[PDB]
Amino acid sequence: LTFQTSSPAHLTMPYVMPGDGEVVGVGEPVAIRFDENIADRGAAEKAIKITTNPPVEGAFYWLNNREVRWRPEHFWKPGTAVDVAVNTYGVDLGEGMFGEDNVQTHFTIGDEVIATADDNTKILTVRVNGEVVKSMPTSMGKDSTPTANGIYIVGSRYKHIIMDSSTYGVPVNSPNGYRTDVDWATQISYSGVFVHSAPWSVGAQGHTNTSHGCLNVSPSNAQWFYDHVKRGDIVEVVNTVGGTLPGIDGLGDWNIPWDQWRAGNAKA
Ligand SMILES: *C(=O)[C@@H]([C@@H]1N=C(C(=O)O)[C@@H](S[C@@H]2CN[C@H](C(=O)N(C)C)C2)[C@@H]1C)[C@@H](C)O
């Protein structure tokens, strides 16, 4: 090791996901998020070495100035081992910022889990390695607030969570201020789309869209989803009146056409 001089005002640390040793779904990108905006994005990329077994072609794309993603063209093949070496220690990241340390993570791809929410049938169907394991009636976004179509990556899971409209800057005791307690919530977009328990819409699930954009399912189906779906599994939404989920949402990565993703967007 070669020592690098440093100052707490001129250092930035990388954080890698997913965690070391984790088993993730086929949609999980590698994510490296820095604790500061990066000016030399080309230098960061060059510092990161991703190796796969079986080997598959992949590429980097920046979600924003803090976070870079790497994925293949198509969903991961189950069983794949992925090694990530972020060799940023002492790397000049531009504007006098330097990499603070190296981080190394290793993870594996589990079963192919793909759930399709079809707005034509109002059924959410979960396939594991091509086989249907579960059908759930669902209620998605009403016409004024539709659920976007596209490919969503499963993120965090919560036994209980608060949906508070003021974090979207729209207060309660307001036009639409809500503060709502929700059980068994699985996050599928950074914009705040969740699959979750909705006892208040059980009669509509399978028939009519009534939500603000979330996938409302029954309490027991929502608990099922929470138990059986992991980070990196895929939810595909089709046939809604909405547009397409933004590719830079945070969990929207697969919505970016491969030619654009591969070309990348790194200021070098
Ligand atoms: C889920 O139902 C939650 C709501 N779902 C949303 C979504 O589908 O993205 C948003 S509301 C929607 C997104 N953009 C519009 C807006 O005015 N902004 C918030 C910027 C409307 C919301 C988190 C919630 C009800 O649990």
Author numbering: 141 to 408
The authors write:
To provide a detailed structural view of how meropenem inhibits LdtMt2, we have determined the crystal structure of LdtMt2Δ130 as a covalent complex with meropenem. Each chain of the meropenem complex contains one meropenem linked to Cys354 by a thioester bond. In the meropenem-complexed structure meropenem is covalently bound to Cys354, mimicking the acyl-enzyme intermediate, and the carbonyl O atom of the opened β-lactam ring is stabilized by the oxyanion hole. In chain B of the meropenem-complex model, clear electron density for meropenem that is contiguous with the Sγ atom of Cys354 was observed, but the electron density was missing beyond the thioether S atom of meropenem. The bond distance between Cys354 Sγ and the carbonyl C atom of meropenem is 1.94 Å, which falls within the typical bond distances (1.81–2.55 Å) of carbon–sulfur single bonds. The ζ-­hydroxyl group of Tyr308 interacts with the meropenem N1 atom and the thioether S atom of meropenem C3. In addition, the pyrroline ring of meropenem is stabilized by the aromatic ring of Tyr308 through hydrophobic interactions. The backbone carbonyl groups of Ser331 and His352, as well as the side chain of His352, also make hydrogen bonds to the bound meropenem. Upon the acylation of LdtMt2 by meropenem, the active-site lid undergoes a large conformational change and partially covers the catalytic Cys354 so that the bound meropenem is accessible to the bulk solvent via three narrow paths. A large conformational change in the active-site lid of LdtMt2 upon acylation by meropenem to partially cover the bound meropenem may explain the long-lived acylated enzyme intermediate.
Among five paralogues of l,d-transpeptidase in Mtb, two functional l,d-­transpeptidases, LdtMt1 (Rv0116c; 251 amino acids) and LdtMt2 (Rv2518c; MT2594; 408 amino acids), have been shown to generate 3→3 cross-links connecting two meso-diaminopimelic acid (meso-DAP) residues at the third position of the stem peptides in vitro. Here, we report the crystal structure of an N-terminally truncated Mtb LdtMt2 (LdtMt2Δ130) that encompasses residues Leu131–Ala408. In this structure, the catalytic l,d-transpeptidase domain (residues Asp251–Val378) is preceded by a bacterial immunoglobulin-like (Ig-like) Big_5 domain (residues His150–Gly250) and followed by an extended C-­terminal tail (residues Asn379–Ala408) that interacts with both domains. Cys354, His336 and Ser337 form the catalytic triad in the active site of the l,d-transpeptidase domain.
